[PDB]
From a paper:
Human transthyretin (TTR), a homotetrameric 127-residue protein, is the main carrier of thyroxine (T4) in celebrospinal fluid (CSF) and the second main carrier in blood. TTR also interacts with other proteins, such as retinol-binding protein (RBP) and thus contributes to retinol transport. Interestingly, TTR also interacts with amyloid-β (Aβ) and plays a protective role in Alzheimer’s disease (AD) by sequestering Aβ and reducing proteopathic stress. We also present the crystal structures of Fe2+, Mn2+ and of Cu2+ bound to TTR crystallized in the presence and absence of Aβ(1–28).
When TTR crystals of the P21212 crystal form are soaked in FeCl2 at acidic pH, only the B monomer in the asymmetric unit changes its conformation, whereby the E-F helix and the stretch of residues 85–92 undergo a rearrangement that is accompanied by a variation in the dimer-dimer interface. Human TTR crystals are particularly sensitive to FeCl2 soaking experiments. The TTR-Fe structure with the strongest anomalous signal in the phased anomalous difference Fourier map, out of 35 successful soak experiments, is reported here. The observed conformational changes surpass those induced by rhenium. The largest anomalous features for the TTR-Fe complex are located in proximity of Glu-51. On A monomers, the electron density can be fitted by a three-atom Fe-cluster and on B monomers by two Fe atoms. An additional Fe site at the entrance of the T4 binding site involves Glu-54 from symmetry related B and B′ monomers belonging to the same tetramer. In total, sixteen Fe atoms (including the clusters in interaction with Glu-51) are bound to each tetramer chelated by just three residues from each monomer. The conformation of the TTR-Fe complex, with an Asp-38–Asp-38 separation of 25.7 Å is intermediate compared to the two TTR-Re complexes. The large shift in the stretch of residues 72–92 of B relative to A with a Thr-123A–Gly-83B distance of 27.0 Å and a large Leu-110–Leu110 asymmetry attests to the largest conformational changes observed in TTR structures to date.
Numbering used by the authors:
A (entry chain B), B (entry chain A), C (entry chain A), D (entry chain B): 10 to 125
Write the structure that this text describes.
Amino acid sequence: CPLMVKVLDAVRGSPAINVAVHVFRKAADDTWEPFASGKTSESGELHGLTTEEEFVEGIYKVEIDTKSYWKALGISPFHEHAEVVFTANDSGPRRYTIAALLSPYSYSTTAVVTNP
Amino acid sequence: CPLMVKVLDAVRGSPAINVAVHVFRKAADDTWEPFASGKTSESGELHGLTTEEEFVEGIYKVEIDTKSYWKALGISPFHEHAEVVFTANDSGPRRYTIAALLSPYSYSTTAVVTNP
Amino acid sequence: CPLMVKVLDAVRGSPAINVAVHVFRKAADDTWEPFASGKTSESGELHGLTTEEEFVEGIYKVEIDTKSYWKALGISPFHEHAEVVFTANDSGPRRYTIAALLSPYSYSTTAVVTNP
Amino acid sequence: CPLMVKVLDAVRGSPAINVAVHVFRKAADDTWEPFASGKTSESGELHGLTTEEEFVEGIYKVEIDTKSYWKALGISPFHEHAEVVFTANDSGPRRYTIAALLSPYSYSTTAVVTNP
Ligand SMILES: [Fe+3]
Ligand SMILES: [Fe+3]
Ligand SMILES: [Fe+3]
Ligand SMILES: [Fe+3]
Ligand SMILES: [Fe+3]
Ligand SMILES: [Fe+3]
Ligand SMILES: [Fe+3]
Ligand SMILES: [Fe+3]
Ligand SMILES: [Fe+3]
Ligand SMILES: [Fe+3]
């Protein structure tokens, strides 16, 4: 798994379950081609999005939708989408972990990049 | 002044200075319309984006252009932007402060609501 | 005012109000001596902790008492405190701002240095 | 592993390797008994600190020292210790993950608590 996504809730200190994640790649004619997608697990993690063979250098957009998570808590969320855009594998192949930390009025996001 | 944006640099222990900030507002056809923009001062604050009477109820998006910020300091950062999305309610006159904390690989955004 | 401490609540989207803050200074026998303390105002700011002439070069520690803060709001938080440790250099007159962002299970501290 | 510790560098976006970690437990006569200790790995993680049989309810202090990490980067760090104090296993057994995010002027720390 070269690309992991974690989502956490800063209020509850728990993993965010069933967050929808959509990954896009910037395509040749200046548009976003679909690339991968999934839901986060009990542990709030999602990998198995791609393989090193499909995860070529390029520009990727990672979108999350947290509607299912707040719904199951009985929370009527105010906002529920977040996104990052980064450039991948420019120095050849790396593993990316992208973590998001949720509060109703605060959003934090961190990227860890490691060598496979 | 009803809308403040404050931005800090976690690497250098200082306000982020001259960072461009674009504020959009969500329009009747669910698109984003430009609302305001500016650059951060030496103390990292940007205000004078809008008057009380022009900052109506709605959904607003603040894009802080951090890629150019880090690149100017000779750092290839991970993110393109820092963003946050928030809702202004039609309530009384209220101060909205958007605070941003920046690293090359991590950032956090927070919307703070007060009365002056 | 050379030492400011600002504290925000990420859950409630507001300044943290009435939070106790204790500042210690590292003494000649490598122990911590009380330096200053106070409570945060309605805008979450605490200043008037020290004068320019009494805030000498050294190593200082800010303990923000967040357990009691969250418990007062009926939340059993994870941390006891938020802390940060920083060094004042003997340089010119400089403004030190300690900013704190608080959730029940996550918190961040930042020391910002400016000139007034 | 009921107790994991991660340490990350927000400047480099990399795991912090060889961070020394010392865990203490609050003992009956109001003092800190040693409990567990270790160094973080290539991936910045440390588990194998304890077992569910030794990780009883109580008050634990987790200390890190990041001297070896900065040394190997050729960095003369200003500060290099951090600590959290929390109460464990009060609602019976839980798994704790404690993550710390480093910048020279900013420190963030998050706790994720999950059900084994
Ligand atoms: Fe499972
Ligand atoms: Fe299960
Ligand atoms: Fe995992
Ligand atoms: Fe101000
Ligand atoms: Fe909001
Ligand atoms: Fe002020
Ligand atoms: Fe410092
Ligand atoms: Fe290894
Ligand atoms: Fe290895
Ligand atoms: Fe692991």
